[PDB]
Amino acid sequence: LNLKVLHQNPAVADPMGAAFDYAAEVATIDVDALTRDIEEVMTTSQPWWPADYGHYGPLFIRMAWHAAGTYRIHDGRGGAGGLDKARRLLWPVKKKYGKKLSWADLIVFAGNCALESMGFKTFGFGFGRVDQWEPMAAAVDIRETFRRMAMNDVETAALIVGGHTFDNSFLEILYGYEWELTLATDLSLRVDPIYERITRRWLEHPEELADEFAKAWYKLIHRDMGPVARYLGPLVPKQTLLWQDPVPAVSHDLVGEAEIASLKSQIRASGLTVSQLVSTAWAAASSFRGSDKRGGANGGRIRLQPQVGWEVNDPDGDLRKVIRTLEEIQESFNSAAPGNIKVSFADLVVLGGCAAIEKAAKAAGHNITVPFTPGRTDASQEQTDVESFAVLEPKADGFRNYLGKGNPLPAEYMLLDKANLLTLSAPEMTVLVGGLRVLGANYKRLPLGVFTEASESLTNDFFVNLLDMGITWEPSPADDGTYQGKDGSGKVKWTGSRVDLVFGSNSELRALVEVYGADDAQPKFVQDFVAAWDKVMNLDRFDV
C-alpha cells in the first residue's frame, strides 16, 4: 500500500500558489493574436530541429495525436489533461504568456492551429486543461487500439484517412492508382471488409469526410475535459454533442433558504430512513472520475437505464423504492411552489443525503448544518449513452463494501484506487469510510464493518471499536474473505472484511484513525465527515 498515490500534486510543489485559478486567466488571452503567433512558430526553420519543408505543420499534428491519443477508457487516466524534446519549438510562443497558457493547451492548440493552417476548418476549440506538476491482423490491431479509446469504426477510419493526408488525397490512391500487391500497417482500409465498406463511399462523396474528420478530431482533443462548462475561450462551438453526456441548461429559478429547509424537512417527514438516502445520495455521486471528469452527481442519471440497473446500486427493491418517493416529493414542490421556482431531481438525490446526515448527526450527539449548493439539472433518457457508461460501473466499490467478480488487485488496493479517482486524500478517505460504515451504506446492508452498536447514528464508533485490542481478529472460523472479531471471552462480537481491517493493520493508516478515535475528538470527526461529504457531492459542479 503506497498512500503517496493519494496526495499527488500537492500545493507545495505548485509554484503558482494556492490563489491561482486557471479559469480566471485563460479567458483574457486573445486567441485572435495567439493564432497569429503559432502561425509564425511554424514556417520558420530552426538550427537544432530543421524542417526544410516550409512547415512544422505535419509535426504539430503528430504531437497532439501522439499526446492526446493515450486515453485509456477503463479507468479514464491519460490523455490531454495529464515527441518530448520537440515541444520546445513552442517555447517562443509560451514565454510571452507564461501562466495564462498551460503546456497542454499550448500543445493541443498548436496541433489544431496547424490543422487549420493546412487548409481545413476544424469544428472548434475550448481551453481549460489545467496542467499537473509531476494484412487483416494489422486491421484488427488498429481496431482494438482505437477501442481502448472509445471510438467507433467510423471515427477511426476517418482519423486514419485524416492525419495521413497531411479530402480526397489519401483516397484516389488507395485502390486509386491501384497497387501491384506490394505500404504500412495501413492499407487495411481496403482489404478489411469492415473498413472497406465505409472508406469507399468517401471516395466519391468527400463532403461527408471533411465533416467527419472534423468531429472526430474534436473528440481526440476534448475527450477528457469533462462536461461542457470548462470549455473556456471564445472558440468553443454553440452546439451539444452526445459523447459529452450533456445536461440541459438551467431554465428554472433555483432555491434559496426557507425552501431548502422545507425540502429537507419534507424528506425527513416521509418514510425514508437514514440508511436509504445516504445509499442513494452516495450511489449517484460515487460514479465520478477525477481524471476524465465525467459522471458525478449532476445530470440526475441514477433514474436512467444505464445506471439504475447496475449491481452496486442494487435495484432489488432498494433503489427503485426511494426514487419513487423523491419523484413524488418533486411533483408536490413543483406545484404551488413558494414562487416561480422548480427543483430538478438531480437535487433531491443529493439534498436527500444532506438531510439524511443532518438527521443522523443531530441524533448522535449534536446538531449541524450540511452545506448544499443548488444548481443541478436532470438529463432525459435520450441524452444518455448506455454504451459509454458500461465503463463507469465500479467492478469493486470499497466504500459500500462491494466486491464483484473479476478482481485484478486485492480488495484494498481497489479502495485505494477508487479514492484516487474521486480525488480524495487519506484523512478524507478514513473519515468517509467511518461515516459510511456507521451510518449504514453497505451493499445489501451486510453487517460487515458495522462496529457500532446502535444503527442510524453518526458516531465515531467505527474508529473506537476497531482499535480496542481486547478483541481478536481470527479469519479461521470464517470461510470467505471475511474476518471475525472474537471477544476476550470467546463469543463472536463483530465482523470485518479486507477493506475494514486494513485501517487497523497498516501503520500508515492506523495513525490516521487515532486522530478520530480519541476521546475528545468526537466533534472533529463530525465536522471532518461533513466537509468530506460536501467535497464529494460537489465534484461535478463546474458552473460554480
Add this chain to the structure above:
Amino acid sequence: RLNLKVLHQNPAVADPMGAAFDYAAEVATIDVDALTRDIEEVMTTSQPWWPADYGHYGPLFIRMAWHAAGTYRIHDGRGGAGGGMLDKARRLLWPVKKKYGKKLSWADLIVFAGNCALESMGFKTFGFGFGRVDQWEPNPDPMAAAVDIRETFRRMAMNDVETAALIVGGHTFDNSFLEILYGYEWELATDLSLRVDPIYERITRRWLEHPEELADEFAKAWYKLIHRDMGPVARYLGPLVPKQTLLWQDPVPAVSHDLVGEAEIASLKSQIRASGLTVSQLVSTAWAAASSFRGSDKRGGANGGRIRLQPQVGWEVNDPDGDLRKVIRTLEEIQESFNSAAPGNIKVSFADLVVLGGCAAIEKAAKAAGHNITVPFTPGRTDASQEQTDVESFAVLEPKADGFRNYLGKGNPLPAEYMLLDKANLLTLSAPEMTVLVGGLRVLGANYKRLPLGVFTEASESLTNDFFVNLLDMGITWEPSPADDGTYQGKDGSGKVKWTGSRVDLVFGSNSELRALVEVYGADDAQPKFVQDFVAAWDKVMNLDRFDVR
C-alpha cells in the same frame, strides 16, 4: 533520474489536523502531574494479548524508548526521536494516548513512557521536555564486540563515558550489574566487554567503589539519548524541563539587550551597503552562516553568530582566503560603532549583522534590476562565545558538497545533482523554492571562489531572472568541456563560447519537472513573481533556526 518526491515529504494534504494546528500551544496545557499518574497505571496492569514479565511493563518501556531514540545516525542527521515509525507492543500505550489524542504526539508519549518507567523504579532522572512534533508517515574479545558497541555508539556521538554508563544503565533499571561483573572473575554475551577491554575496564572498575557518580552519569546519558533530536533549547515545552545549560545543545545566551526597532533597522541596513562590502560578499557570508542547518536535527542555522568562531570560519566551503576575513572585520566594526553610539539602550548582536547584511545586500541588488523590494527581517538573534561551540561536534555539519554554491568536495557517494537534492531536503525546502534559490544565488554571485560556472547573466550584481532565461533558450548548444573536469560549455550558433554551465544547473535545464518549474519563472512579464518568490524563499531560509528559538 532524480526523485523530486523527497522534497515535498509530509504535505499538509495528508495532515488530518489542518493547517491551523501548532504543536506548541496545546502540549503546554498537559498536566504532567496527572499524566504520570496514568502511565504509572498502564505499567502495573497486565493484559491478555501481551503478558507482562513479572507483571510489570517497566523494562519493556525502557527498551522501547531505546529502540526508538537509538537510531540517530549523525553522518546525515536523520533518524532519532522526532520521527519514523516494537509497534506490535506500542498499542499497549493506547489507554493513555486516547485520553488526549491531540495534545500528546506518539513520539512524546513513547519517550515519556520510557522516562516515567525509569522514574517508577527508584531513579530520579534529569528532566523531560515535550515538543517532538509528529510527522505522520512517509568470543567476547575486545575486537569482537567491545569495538562494535564503541562504533555503533560513535554514529550517535556518545563518548566512552556515556556508552559505558548506558550499558551499565539499561541492564539494572544504582549498581548491582557491576557487583556481579567484578564480583566473579569467571571468564552477558555482547557485554562483559567492560571487564576485558582495557578502555572500558579503566572506568567501569572505578564505579565499584564510588557508586554515586554512575547515577548522575547515567542521568546525563539518558537525557542526551532522548533529547538529542530536538535542537536548541527553546523547543523544550512542558514544566519538567530543567534550568541548566548543557554543552551538547550548542547553547546561545539569552537576550540581555533590547532589540532593534524599524527606526534602527533602516539605519543599520543603510550602513552595511554604505561601507566597502559589495553584493557578492554579503550574500555569500549570510548564506554560509545559514546554510549549516539540518531540518532533520534542528541544530545549526543562522542563530548563535558562530560564523566568526573556529569550527565554522575555518571550513573549506566558507573559503577563508580573503572572503570570511574582510567581511567579519567590517561587520564587527559596524556592530561596535552602532553599539557605542546607540540611539538608546538598544544594542544589536552580531548574529544579525551577518543576516541583516544579507537582506541589505538583496535590497541593494534587486534595485538595479528595476524593482524596489523590502526584505522581511525579524531581530532577536544572539551571539555565542567561543567556549560553547564544541569544535569536535561541528565536523559533522561540514558540507561535503553544497549544490547552491557549486562546491564539490571529495569522496561523494552520489553525483553532483543528488547532493543538491539532499541539501535542499535538509533545509526543509520545496521544489519551487529550491529552483528560485538556485537562480538567485547564481545571478547574484555566490559561487565558491566566484567561479563563473553558472553565472548565465551578463551584468552580475543585479537580481534578474536571467539564469532561467538563458538556460531555456535553445539557440545555444550544450556539450561537455574538452578539458573534462566535470563541467560543460554552451556554444552559440556561430561557434564562440558564450556560457559555462555545470552539472548542478544543467540538471535544471535537462530534467522534466525542473524544466517546468524553470519555465514558470523563465517566462516574460514574470520577473516580479520571481523576485517575490526569491525574497520569500530567502526570508524562509534565514528564519530556519529562529522560528524554534522564539
